Structures are given as structure tokens and as C-alpha cells.
């Protein structure tokens, strides 16, 4: 819109043994 | 809209043994 | 809208042995 | 000053019929 | 000053019919 | 000053019929 | 961690006459 | 970590007369 | 880490007379 | 009959 | 019958 | 019958 | 609709 | 629609 | 539509 | 260690 | 270690 | 270590 | 004696 | 004695 | 004695 | 009369 | 009379 | 009379 | 003013 | 003003 | 003004 701000942070981990 | 702010943070873990 | 703020934080864990 | 924070949000509406 | 923060958001509407 | 932050957002609407 | 927030503000004064 | 935020502000004064 | 943010602001004054 | 039907609708979501 | 039907619609999403 | 039908539509998304 | 404004 | 404005 | 504006 | 998974 | 996965 | 995966 | 000793350790700090 | 000693260690810091 | 000693270590810092 | 008049002023706004 | 008048002013705005 | 009048002014805006 | 500091 | 500092 | 500093 007008002056909007968006932040996204994602972390994924898969340990298979 | 006008001056909006959005923040998202996600973490996922899968340990399979 | 006008001056809104939103924050989301999520954590998921699955330990399978 | 030191570490201050200020937030202002304003909305005005005028419907004339 | 030192580490200050300021945010302003404004919305104005005029419907004339 | 030192490390200051300023944000301004403005919206204006005029519907004349 | 996930979505954490930390704020610190400090002021020190020493007047010696 | 994931989506973390940190803010620090410091002020020091020494008047010697 | 992932999407981290850090801000530091410092001010020091020494008046000797 | 000058203006048989007149209608106004206003929606403001803020 | 001058203006048989008149209609106005206004939507403002902010 | 001068103006049989008149219509106005306004959409503002901000 | 029908709105009269005179100022 | 039908709007009269005179100023 | 039908809008009259006179200023 | 010793983990058996069958799906 | 010793992990057996069959899917 | 010792990991067996069959899919 | 097939597997004399088996050990698993999992630490999750979030 | 097939596998005398088996060990697993997992550390996740997030 | 097929595999006398087996070891796994995993460290994830995020 | 060595120092007839001495004055000090300190203002700190934080 | 050595120093008839002495004055100091300090203003700190932070 | 050595130093009839002495004055100091300090302004710090931060 | 008149300030004496000795350290 | 008049400030004496000795260190 | 008049400031004496000796260190």
C-alpha cells in the first residue's frame, strides 16, 4: 500500500540417520 | 494499508533415527 | 489498516526414534 | 531521548450527502 | 536523540455527493 | 541525532460527485 | 531464538565540581 | 537465530569543573 | 542467523574546565 | 415524475 | 420523467 | 425522458 | 443519488 | 448518480 | 453518471 | 542408536 | 549410529 | 556411522 | 551379542 | 558381535 | 565383529 | 578580594 | 582583586 | 586586577 | 566557577 | 570560569 | 574562560 513493510524468515532442518 | 508492518518467523525440525 | 502491526512466531519439533 | 519510541495513527472520515 | 524511533500514519477521506 | 529513525505515511482521498 | 526482541537503554551522568 | 531483533542505545556524560 | 537485525547507537561526552 | 428512483451507497473500511 | 434512475456507489478500502 | 439511466462506480484501494 | 450542496 | 454542487 | 459542479 | 522405521 | 529406514 | 536408507 | 551397546542423544534448543 | 558399539549425537540450536 | 565401532555427530546452528 | 564572584551552572537533559 | 568575576555554563541535551 | 572577567559557554546537542 | 580537583 | 585540575 | 589543566 503506502509505507508498508513485510519481513519473513524461515528455517527448515531434517536429520535422517 | 497505510503504515502497516508484518513480521513472520518459522522454524521446523525433524530428527529421524 | 492504518498503523497496524502483526507478529507471528512458530516452532515445530518432531523426534522419532 | 535515549531509546525512545513514538507511534501515531490517525483516521478521519466525512460523508456528506 | 540517541536511538530514537518515530512512526506516523495518517488517512483522510471526504465523500461528497 | 545518533541512530535515529523516522517514518511517515500519508493517504488522502476526495470523491466528489 | 525465533522471533525474539531485545531492547536496552542506558544513561549515565557524573557532575563533579 | 531466526527473525531476531536487537537494539542498544547508550549515553554517557562527564562534567568536570 | 536467518533474518536477524542489530542496531547500536552510542554517545559519549566529556566537558573538562 | 422527475427522478423516479435515486440511490446512494457508501462503504468505508479503514 | 427526466432522470428515471440514478445510482452512485463508493467503496474506500484503506 | 432526458437521461433514462445514470450510474457511477468508484473504488479506491490504498 | 440526489444530493444538493450549496455553500 | 445525480449530484449538484455549487460553491 | 450525472454530476454537476459549478464553482 | 538402534532405530527401525518402516512405513 | 545404527538407523534403519525403509519406506 | 552406520545408516541404512532404502526407499 | 549382536549390538552390545546402542546410544542416542538429541538436544534441541529453540 | 556384529556392531559392538553404535552412537548418535544430534544438536540443533535455532 | 563386522563394524566394531560406529559414530555419528551432527551439529546445526541456525 | 581574590575571586569576588564565582558561578557555575550545569543543565543535563536526557 | 585577581579574578573579579568567573562564570561557567554547560548545557547537554541528549 | 589580573583577569577582570572570564566566561565559558558549552552547548552540546546530540 | 571555582573547582579544585587533585587526584 | 576558574577550574583547576591536577592529576 | 580560565581553565588550568596539568597532568
Residue numbers in the entry:
A (entry chain A), B (entry chain J), C (entry chain S), D (entry chain Y), E (entry chain P), F (entry chain G), ...: 1 to 17
J (entry chain Z), K (entry chain Q), L (entry chain H), S (entry chain T), T (entry chain K), U (entry chain B), ...: 4 to 17
M (entry chain a), N (entry chain R), O (entry chain I), P (entry chain U), Q (entry chain L), R (entry chain C), ...: 1 to 7
Provide the authors' own sentences about this structure as they appear in the paper:
Supporting this hypothesis, we here determined the fibril structure of two AMPs from amphibians, uperin 3.5 and aurein 3.3, by cryogenic electron microscopy (cryo-EM), revealing amyloid cross-β fibrils of mated β-sheets at atomic resolution. For both of the studied ffAMPs, cryo-EM data unambiguously prove an amyloid cross-β structure comprised of β-sheets with tightly coupled dry interfaces and strands perpendicular to the fibril axis. Despite the dissimilarity in lateral fibril structure and the difference of extended versus kinked β-sheets, the 17-residue ffAMPs uperin 3.5 and aurein 3.3 are remarkably similar in their residue composition. Overall, compared to other amyloids, the sequence content of the two AMPs indicates a dominant apolar and positively charged nature, which fits the functional interactions with negatively charged bacterial membranes.
The cross-α form was also recently shown by the crystal structure of the antibacterial peptide uperin 3.5 secreted by Uperoleia mjobergii (Mjoberg’s toadlet), which forms fibrils with amyloid properties. Here, a cryo-EM study of uperin 3.5 in the absence of lipids reveals the presence of β-rich fibril polymorphs, and the atomic details of the cross-β configuration, allowing for a direct comparison to the cross-α fibril and exposing the substantial polymorphism of the same sequence. While the unique morphology of the most abundant polymorph (type I; relative abundance 71%) makes both individual fibrils in the micrographs and two-dimensional class averages easy to identify, variations between the other fibril types are more subtle. We find a propeller-shaped structure with threefold rotational symmetry about the fibril axis, where each of the three asymmetric units per filament layer comprises three chains (labeled A, B, C, along with their symmetry equivalents: A’, A”, etc.) of distinct conformation. An atomic model of the uperin 3.5 peptide built into each asymmetric unit (propeller blades) shows excellent agreement with the data in the inner section of the fibrils, comprising full-length (17 residues) monomers in chain A, and 14 and 7 residues in chains B and C, respectively. Chains A and B are tightly interdigitated and form β-sheets along the fibril axis, both hallmark features of a canonical amyloid cross-β fibril. Chain C is almost perpendicular to the other two. The center of the uperin 3.5 propeller is composed of inward-facing Arg7 and Leu5 residues from chains A, A’ and A”, creating a positively charged and hydrophobic core. In the cross-β fibril, Arg7 on chains A, A’ and A” is buried in the core of the fibril, while on chains B, B’ and B”, it is facing outwards, but with the charge being compensated by interactions with Asp4. Inaccessible charge of Arg7 in the cross-β fibril might support an inactive storage form in contrast to interacting with bacterial membranes.
